Design a protein around this ligand. Structure first.
Ligand SMILES: O=C(O)CCC(=O)NCCCCCCOC(=O)c1[nH]c2cc(Cl)ccc2c1-c1c(-c2ccc(F)cc2)ncn1Cc1ccc(Cl)cc1
Ligand SMILES: O=C(O)CCC(=O)NCCCCCCOC(=O)c1[nH]c2cc(Cl)ccc2c1-c1c(-c2ccc(F)cc2)ncn1Cc1ccc(Cl)cc1
Lengths: 95, 94
């Protein structure tokens, strides 16, 4: 829908901060598709209860490792392109 | 398109180094669309002749401000998503 599936399969190498965050949620590899990165980020957000209890599509990442990476205090999980961009800033795409 | 049309219109604010570079090929503003940033980078690459004479789609940015911004010694200009990624690290989205 919002992101083409070919792009979701884009092979990527998270920078150290992002990678540590993925590892804290059980990620084992140093390379991932963007889909895998997103799944693991969903896991982190949910386990740390970063979503707002009342408005569960709003993630409050301020004062969390995630907000340091994304550089915003909050975001909507409905804006896929913005999220992809914030993630792209924290990785290298692989050849 | 490997880059959707609307991603090209994304409003962005270059960080100081990338903005120095854009200004060096005539950039007047402090915020831009991604399309405009690419254009100015294209002119930078062409004016400094960072493309390979033999393989004109390959850019050798090693040992140049560009390569320091991009974090690679070379890249192909057909790798659009890589390129947008390398640029995005050097700016803030508005
Ligand atoms: O009842 C309703 O009204 C809504 C119920 C509903 O529609 N959906 C339930 C949600 C499915 C969630 C499981 C799969 O989601 C993900 O893996 C996922 N990963 C993310 C990473 C980031 Cl940085 C942000 C959000 C999500 C997220 C998720 C979430 C989510 C929300 C809160 C939370 F704590 C964790 C995940 N909701 C939808 N999604 C899907 C999605 C996938 C990719 C992108 Cl770019 C954006 C969204
Ligand atoms: O058949 C052939 O022989 C090749 C002929 C051909 O198709 N030539 C077309 C060249 C058009 C150049 C005009 C527009 O290009 C750009 O503005 C542009 N900007 C860029 C910035 C970077 Cl970081 C890298 C490449 C370019 C680039 C360019 C270049 C280019 C190549 C070498 C060079 F010295 C300068 C620009 N070629 C095509 N493009 C288009 C383009 C636009 C966006 C993206 Cl993500 C990637 C590519």
């Amino acid at each position: 829908m919002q992101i083409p599936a070919s792009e979701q399969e884009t092979l990527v190498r998270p920078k150290p901060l992002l990678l540590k965050l993925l590892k804290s949620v059980g990620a084992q590899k140093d390379t991932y598709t963007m889909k895998e990165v997103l799944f693991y980020l969903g896991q982190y957000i949910m386990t740390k209860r970063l979503y707002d209890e009342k408005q569960q599509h709003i993630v409050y990442c301020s004062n969390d490792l995630l907000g340091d990476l994304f550089g915003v205090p909050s975001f909507s999980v409905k804006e896929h392109r913005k999220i992809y961009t914030m993630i792209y800033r924290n990785l290298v795409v692989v050849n």
